[PDB]
Amino acid sequence: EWNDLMRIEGKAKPPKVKGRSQVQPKLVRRQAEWRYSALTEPFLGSNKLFKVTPVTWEDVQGARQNELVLNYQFRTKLNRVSFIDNYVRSVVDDGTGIVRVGWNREIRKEKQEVPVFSLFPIQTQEQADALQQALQLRTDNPRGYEENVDEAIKESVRFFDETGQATYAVQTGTTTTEVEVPLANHPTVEMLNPENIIIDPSCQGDINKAMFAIVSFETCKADLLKEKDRYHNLNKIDWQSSAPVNEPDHATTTPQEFQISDPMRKRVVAYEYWGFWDIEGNGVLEPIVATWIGSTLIRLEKNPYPDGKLPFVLIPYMPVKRDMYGEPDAELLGDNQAVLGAVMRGMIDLLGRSANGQRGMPKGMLDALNSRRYREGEDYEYNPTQNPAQMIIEHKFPELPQSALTMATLQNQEAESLTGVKAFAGGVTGESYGDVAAGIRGVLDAASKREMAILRRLAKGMSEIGNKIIAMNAVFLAEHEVVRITNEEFVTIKREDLKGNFDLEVDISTAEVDNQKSQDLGFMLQTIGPNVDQQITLNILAEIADLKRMPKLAHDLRTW
Amino acid sequence: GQRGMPKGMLDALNSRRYREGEDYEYNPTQNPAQMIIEHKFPELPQSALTM
Amino acid sequence: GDINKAMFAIVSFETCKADLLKEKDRYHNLNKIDWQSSAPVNEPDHATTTPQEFQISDPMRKRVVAYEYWGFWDIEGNGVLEPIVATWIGSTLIRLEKNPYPDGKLPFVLIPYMPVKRDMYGEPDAELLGDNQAVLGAVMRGMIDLLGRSAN
Amino acid sequence: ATLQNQEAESLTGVKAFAGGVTGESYGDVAAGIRGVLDAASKREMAILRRLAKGMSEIGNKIIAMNAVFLAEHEVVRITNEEFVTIKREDLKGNFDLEVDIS
Amino acid sequence: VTPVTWEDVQGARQNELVLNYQFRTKLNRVSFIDNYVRSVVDDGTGIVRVG
Amino acid sequence: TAEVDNQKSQDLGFMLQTIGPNVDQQITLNILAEIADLKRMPKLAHDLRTW
Amino acid sequence: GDINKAMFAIVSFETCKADLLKEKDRYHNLNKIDWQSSAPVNEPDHATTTP
Amino acid sequence: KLTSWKNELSLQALKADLDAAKPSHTAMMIKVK
């Protein structure tokens, strides 16, 4: 009903009349139209989307590493602008937004020739110097070590890492070995159609208290074959039986008649069950996942993600107390839209149905010749009894009553009062999102704070998504990938500490936050004596340089 | 949007010509400018807005 | 609603024999092509500004419509999809090979003016303004008719 | 006529002789910090960012293609500096670079 | 083009120089920009082919 | 609230200005520690405290 | 009129067997309970959004 | 056979895919027109 009100469909459409208009102005569309651009801007003002801050003094390296990895992943693997637009539009239009977070992995086996090296004891000072230079290069610059050191010295360094004794290796022969090259290792974030996902109704208004959640999506055989070990009973599946046209419950934009010729690439609907079950029957509930296509159960296993919660995030546009869902603005504005449309139709019918351009002539004022002369457009002579100035009538549009304009203005004012959105005012709440930047001594009009609250509600969901993705990256990503992305030493996170989010805090980053942090750092540097300690000054300067996006200068200052 | 026309002002042919949307001729006894009425919305009283 | 999730993309363009001969190794079966059969006028589907009756005398410089297929196919039949490219003119397949570009994605970029949630395409401003334009035109026509039809 | 014009301007958000200065404020450190613009400017800014995203994608694709197709001597001629080599394995994932409109 | 890490300055400068030279020499930037913006505004969606 | 932290920072700065910087190093280091803490700089505060 | 001076307070909530079994020591006589007899539909006094 | 691949697409598959995808594009183009 809300979508029909938004798009003027269903009951919202005016009745069809042969001799009258069928026009309706779009009020809810307009109010949401400024809201979209009001909300979307804060999330796209800077190149960096996520900000990670340490909780203690020991967490700085981990926070920097996780921030770099998360920013790289969001910049490369996802289209940020489209995702933000879809997220904001769904939240505004439906009142509730469900986000699905998952992991995508694909590995290909390849065979490459690998040289065989035979160890030999280190002799003379030249070998020791070469090994020391290789170790120093690895410590200072991983990329230079990977590109320039060459394979034999790399093998020597690996043996030094494994065994304390230094050794020298000489190539003997080449042997073919099987190596796995992963094409894609990146998280996936996707908005979900509300009709697709079904949540436990007995959750008592809290998503975490929900026992189970079921989501239906479109998939092909290639996606299932990407991870062969994960799925079973693939041969028993009949692809024709499970089709988008066959299941009316699934809501999708795919045409009903579209079918790909290749059986491997054909799309079939599948279901998943995320919830808690008593697997051992002793009264202990643990998270599980189950996937079935049609009537065949293909996948059954425990929850793979470390967090142990359902990978869904809900964000309400307008919260309802002790309720999970939210409400849009169409509920308050449907009546006003209907009344405004009725008034506008009345005015347009009034103008259209009237006769315009016609001319009325009294009988007997002009005889045949004079009437013809008047019609052609030349001078004429009339009977003095009738006065052409008054008797000749040229029709015009009727005058509009003031009641229609007054009522249209009243409906518009009531709509703006209820919604809190004006045509050409507001929208600048995003510049004041930063706490240190503008929260301190920041005065905004009454209309800005509602948008501020909505922005905070969206930012909470964004922070939850970031935390989930960080938790997944802590396990799935390997050491060499993180070293390649960050070009720094790796920091390890213990598996038992993964359940509880310590040492980290995730929040949306804005341009003004960085400027205010730079000003605070400058003030702190001014307050402390420059000659008190050189290390503190160098670290402060490096922190200031980082916020200004000069990494070479910051690295030079740090290692000075 | 309704239109009311007095009886006898226009004969059959002139009435049809008026209805189609072309020029016509009327009897001088009655004046179409005042006789032809196009109904409109009534004016809202000030009492409702004041209250 | 995601361009990256698309399995395939097909684009039609106008080309001449010289362009194909620029890279002889890439294309095959050039002799079997009948140039007259494949023409912009012959195919109503292709949309172009070229005049229907315009024709270049030189056979080498004559323009013919061609099609390309950018998508993922299971080349080895073991369930692994890899990007490919295929070009055909008329009913003859001239080129077939893997994706040359390092990125491995379809070389197309889509930008929407006004995004539609869970949809690829966008919308212009004419959708909202058509009725207003019609009403304004009607009012202006009424005013001009009122002035013009009067005797002055 | 005035009502139709006002409704069209409200729906579209574009006026006759106002606005259009959003592009000068696109710079992040330039004007995004402590930059206040009217409500009508932010829609144009959003559309401009949507265009800039496609421009960045085009630039990334062209850089990826230049990484393979262009030879060493051509790049040396263009830049008049020493050549820097990029490995073929790193071509799939865009590391070390970020492209944006200047 | 901006570096992500401290080692990327030379590569960023090289790629920026090459890209700017190519776009300045091999293309008519003004006409391309006008066509791009006009098509995006008029049709609501713009498709760019890179080769 | 955010403004409470700012006002506490201003009060600490005023107290640091009023008291002689050289009368006691421990008091100055401590005051700098709470000033850094209110600015969300745990590492700087820890460095100042254990200096 | 004072909450602290209140002698008793009674609250009704919805729970499952797993919640009670989380801490087995606290609860007794779990077997004697019949789950069907005590249901949200059975008790009109309890107000909840559960269907 | 243009290529040495074990499974080759052939022109009929591409033509069938184009014919299948055509109806949606044809309906969409009406809005742009």
- DSSP output for D37-62: --HHHHHHHHHHHHHHHHHHHHHHHH
Does G14 contact A285 at a Cβ distance shorter than 8 Å? no
- Chain D interface mutation, best of E1, E37, E47, highest count of D Cβ atoms under 10 Å: E1
| Sheet (strand A296-302) strand order | A198-199, A212-220, A267-277, A286-293, A296-302
Query: Dihedral of the CA atoms C112, C114, C116, C117 (nearest 10)?
Result: 100
Which sign, positive or negative, has the C-alpha torsion A375, A376, A382, A387? positive
Q: Nearest Cα to A265, choosing from E12, B42, G50, H16?
A: H16
Quickly count: other Cβ atoms within 10 Å of residue F36's Cβ.
23
Does E6 contact A555 at a Cβ distance shorter than 8 Å? yes
The two structure tokens encoding residue A279 = 């697997």
The Cα B2–Cα A252 span in angstroms is: 47
CA distances (Å), A121 to each of A118, A334, A483, in order?
10, 86, 31
Residue A199, min C-alpha distance to chain G (Å)? 12
Q: Is E10 on the interface with A (CB under 8 A)?
A: no
The Cα A473–Cα A465 span in angstroms is: 12
Using CB atoms, pick whichever of E2, E5, E9 lies closest to residue A487.
Answer: E5
Q: Nearest Cα to A156, choosing from A179, A122, A124, A123?
A: A122
∠ Cα G13 G19 G21 (to 5°): 135
The Cα A428–Cα A367 span in angstroms is: 73
Question: Which residues in chain A touch residue F44, judged by CB atoms under 8 angstroms apart?
Answer: 524, 536, 539-540
Question: Which residues in chain A touch residue H21, judged by CB atoms under 8 angstroms apart?
Answer: 258
The Cα A88–Cα D86 span in angstroms is: 39
The Cα A197–Cα A98 span in angstroms is: 8
- With contact defined as beta carbons under 8 Å apart, do E35 and E43 qualify? no
Q: Phi/psi at E18 (nearest 5 deg)?
A: -65, -45
- With contact defined as beta carbons under 8 Å apart, do A330 and A2 qualify? yes
Does F40 contact A53 at a Cβ distance shorter than 8 Å? yes
The Cα D62–Cα D53 span in angstroms is: 14
Close Cβ partners of C84 (under 8 Å, ≥ 6 residues apart): C69, C70, C71, C72, C73, C75, C96, C97, C98, C99, H9
Q: Is A368 on the interface with F (CB under 8 A)?
A: no
Question: Which residues in chain C touch residue H18, judged by CB atoms under 8 angstroms apart?
Answer: 10, 67
Question: Which residues in chain B touch residue A363, judged by CB atoms under 8 angstroms apart?
Answer: 25-28
Chain H residue with CA closest to A253: the answer is H24
Close Cβ partners of D24 (under 8 Å, ≥ 6 residues apart): D31
- With contact defined as beta carbons under 8 Å apart, do A512 and A438 qualify? yes
The Cα D47–Cα A276 span in angstroms is: 44
Q: Are strands A359-362 and B24-26 parallel, antiparallel or unpaired?
A: parallel
Positions of E strands within A8-154? 50-54, 96-121
Residue C11, min C-alpha distance to chain E (Å)? 9
- Way the structure was solved: cryo-EM
| Sheet (strand A312-316) strand order | A167-192, A96-121, A312-316
CA distances (Å), B9 to each of A66, A208, A366, in order?
89, 80, 19
Using CB atoms, pick whichever of D70, D96, D100 lies closest to residue E11.
Answer: D96
Using CB atoms, pick whichever of A25, A41, A72 lies closest to residue D45.
Answer: A41
Touching E (3+ Cβ pairs <8 A), the chains are A, C, D
Touching D (3+ Cβ pairs <8 A), the chains are A, C, E
Burial class (CB in 10 A: 0-12, 13-18, 19+), F2: middle
Q: Is C126 on the interface with D (CB under 8 A)?
A: no
- With contact defined as beta carbons under 8 Å apart, do A170 and A118 qualify? yes
Q: Is A212 on the interface with D (CB under 8 A)?
A: no
CA distances (Å), A108 to each of A227, A382, C12, C80, in order?
11, 101, 33, 9
The Cα E28–Cα A439 span in angstroms is: 47
Q: What type of residue is A173?
A: G
Q: Is H16 on the interface with C (CB under 8 A)?
A: no
Q: Do chains E and A touch (3 or more CB pairs under 8 A)?
A: yes
Q: What type of residue is A521?
A: L
What SS3 string covers C106-145?
A: CCEEEEECCECCCCCCECCCHHHHHHHHHHHHHHHHHHHH
Using CB atoms, pick whichever of E1, E10, E37 lies closest to residue D84.
Answer: E10
Residue A169, beta-bridge partner list: A119
- With contact defined as beta carbons under 8 Å apart, do D21 and D31 qualify? no
Q: Is G39 on the interface with A (CB under 8 A)?
A: no
The helix/strand/coil state of A350 is helix
Q: What type of residue is C20?
A: L
Q: Is G46 on the interface with A (CB under 8 A)?
A: no
- Chain A interface mutation, best of E5, E9, E40, E45, highest count of A Cβ atoms under 10 Å: E5
Chain A residue with CA closest to F5: the answer is A440
Chain C residue with CA closest to E40: the answer is C113
Which sign, positive or negative, has the C-alpha torsion D99, D101, E1, E2? negative
The Cα C137–Cα C143 span in angstroms is: 10
The two structure tokens encoding residue C116 = 């539609």
Q: Is F42 on the interface with A (CB under 8 A)?
A: yes
Close Cβ partners of A432 (under 8 Å, ≥ 6 residues apart): A438, A439, A442, A444, A448, A452
Does H20 contact A259 at a Cβ distance shorter than 8 Å? yes
Does C112 contact E49 at a Cβ distance shorter than 8 Å? no
Resolution limit, Å: 3.0
Angle between helices A330-353 and C126-149 (to 10 degrees): 20
The two structure tokens encoding residue A85 = 């637009």
Q: What count of CB pairs under 8 Å joins A to C?
A: 56
Residues 230-289 (A) with a CB less than 8 A from some CB of F? none
Query: Dihedral of the CA atoms A22, A28, A33, A35 (nearest 10)?
Result: 170
Q: Is C110 on the interface with A (CB under 8 A)?
A: no
CA distances (Å), C143 to each of A396, B27, C15, C149, D24, in order?
9, 28, 53, 10, 42
Q: Do chains F and B touch (3 or more CB pairs under 8 A)?
A: no
CA distances (Å), A107 to each of A74, A175, C80, C82, E19, in order?
21, 22, 11, 13, 33
Q: Phi/psi at G23 (nearest 5 deg)?
A: -125, 90
Q: Nearest Cα to A171, choosing from A220, A117, A210, A232?
A: A117
The Cα A169–Cα A157 span in angstroms is: 10
Residue A272, beta-bridge partner list: A215, A291
Q: Nearest Cα to A376, choosing from C151, C2, F24, B39?
A: C151
Q: Phi/psi at A470 (nearest 5 deg)?
A: -65, -45
CA distances (Å), A112 to each of A151, A154, A174, in order?
15, 18, 10
Q: Is C77 on the interface with H (CB under 8 A)?
A: yes
Q: Is B45 on the interface with A (CB under 8 A)?
A: no
Close Cβ partners of A386 (under 8 Å, ≥ 6 residues apart): A362, A364, A365, B28
Does A262 contact H13 at a Cβ distance shorter than 8 Å? yes
Using CB atoms, pick whichever of F2, F45, F48 lies closest to residue A439.
Answer: F2
Long-range pairs, D55-59, Cβ under 8 A, ≥24: D55/D101, D56/D99, D56/D100, D56/D101, D57/C109, D58/C109, D58/E48, D58/E50, D59/D99, D59/E19
Touching B (3+ Cβ pairs <8 A), the chains are A
Q: Is E6 on the interface with A (CB under 8 A)?
A: yes
Residue A551, min C-alpha distance to chain E (Å)? 5
Q: Is A404 on the interface with B (CB under 8 A)?
A: yes
Touching C (3+ Cβ pairs <8 A), the chains are A, D, E, H
Please give the distance of CA A253 from its chain centroid, rounded to a whole number: 20
**What is the DSSP annotation of E1-51?**
-EESSGGGHHHHHHHHHHHHHHHHHSS-HHHHHHHHHHHHHHHSEEEEE--
The two structure tokens encoding residue C16 = 């001449």
Per-residue b or e along A55-94, where b marks 16 or more CB atoms closer than 10 Å to that residue's CB: eeeebbebbbbbbbbbbbbbbebbbebbbbbbbbbbbbbb
Question: Which residues in chain A touch residue C74, judged by CB atoms under 8 angstroms apart?
Answer: 222, 262, 264-265
Query: Dihedral of the CA atoms A424, A429, A432, A435 (nearest 10)?
Result: 170
Q: Is E41 on the interface with C (CB under 8 A)?
A: yes
Close Cβ partners of E26 (under 8 Å, ≥ 6 residues apart): none
The Cα A233–Cα A299 span in angstroms is: 9
The Cα G3–Cα A343 span in angstroms is: 55
Using CB atoms, pick whichever of C135, C139, C150 lies closest to residue A394.
Answer: C150
